[PDB]
């Protein structure tokens, strides 16, 4: 929150805080209409900007905010994790029920798309990748990987049953291991950041 003087340069009007700078901007206790953030403190400063008409005193005040994750957890991170688990539970069904596991995979993909659509409408339209975007991308990758693994198992059926059985038992445990590793690394790098 930068304020200064319009029309009065530094040689005419200077600003200063009336009390100690740490005690001049005072936020009330019940003065918080924040729903998504958390006010941590304030920070004032004073400086000079050089414009086309002269030097002007500018008083700066920074309010430090931290976004609360409780909404986005229940909104995006819990449905995505539950949807990937719903994709990974397909590995326990028998290889003789092909419409069952196909409908699992494809409806899980539908669920991931509607989740990504509902979750993309929350964030403003930035032109880069956020952490939630990376999470949704990796979860979509895991879901798609589950469906392609099912396709490999189904395609390898009726020609080599042992290879299909081996890769479905190995991929029945490799998917939760990799998803847990991704979760550990992601939450560690974005909670200690």
């Amino acid at each position, epitope marked *: 929150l930068k304020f200064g003087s319009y029309a009065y340069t530094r040689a005419e009007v200077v600003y200063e805080w009336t009390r100690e700078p*740490a005690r001049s901007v005072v936020v009330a206790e019940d003065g918080s209409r924040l729903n998504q953030y958390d006010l941590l403190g304030q*920070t*004032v*400063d004073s400086g000079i900007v050089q414009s086309s008409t002269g030097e002007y005193v500018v008083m700066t005040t920074h309010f430090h905010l931290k976004r609360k994750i409780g909404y986005f957890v229940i909104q995006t991170y819990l449905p995505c994790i539950m949807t990937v688990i719903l994709s990974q539970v397909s590995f326990w069904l028998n290889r003789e029920s092909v419409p069952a596991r196909t409908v699992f995979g494809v409806t899980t993909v539908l669920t991931m798309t509607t989740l990504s659509i509902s979750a993309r409408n929350s964030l403003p339209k930035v032109a880069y990748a956020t952490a939630m975007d990376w999470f949704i991308a990796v979860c979509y990758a895991f879901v798609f990987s589950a469906l392609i693994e099912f396709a490999t198992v189904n395609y390898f059926t009726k020609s080599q049953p042992a290879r299909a059985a081996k890769i479905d038992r190995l991929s029945r445990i490799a998917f939760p291991l990799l998803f847990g590793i991704f979760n550990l690394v992601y939450w560690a790098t974005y909670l200690n950041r």
Partner: antibody
Amino acid sequence: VQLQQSGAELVKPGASVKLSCTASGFNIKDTYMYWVKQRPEQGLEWIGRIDPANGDTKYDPKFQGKATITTDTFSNTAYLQLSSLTSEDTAVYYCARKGLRWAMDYWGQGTSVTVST
Amino acid sequence: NIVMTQSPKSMSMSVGERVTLSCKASEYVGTYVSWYQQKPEQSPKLLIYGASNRYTGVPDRFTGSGSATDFTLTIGSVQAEDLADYHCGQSYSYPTFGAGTKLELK
């Protein structure tokens, strides 16, 4: 413009002293007035400040209860009274006023309190 | 209580050479760090008010450099009257000064 302090004092440990700082060249109701202490061959220590236009005072946690700062506007004077002085606060006591970017631009002349027998 | 640590506590230096003094704050002090000069048995004189602003009557050889926590005071062509103490003090909160730095001649 100018701050004038009193002369040195030689008091006995356990009594009270009152130091004065008289301002010449400005009205003390426009700025804050600071009291600083400096021991021989050491760094400065902020005692407290007073807002003479209001009367609000703030003190250093290592001086709360010991020192008390008052002001008299009619003669442009700031007073510092120390209550119970022990055998270590033999320092120089400076009187300062706030400046442009909350600095102490004008200082006094120093008042050397001394406790002995 | 924001603590200002000044370094070094004592230094020696010759005539006509650049010198840099440093002041580090524990908490945030925006640009409200001031540099005072104190000769023995005299009152301190304000040299640099705020981070990088010279006071009226200070030569153009003193210059300050500011940040959120790290502050420096640089003297250029150092003359023979700078045999004094230099204190850094913060004014973001209730004022606290540094320990002091004694410039010497050798």
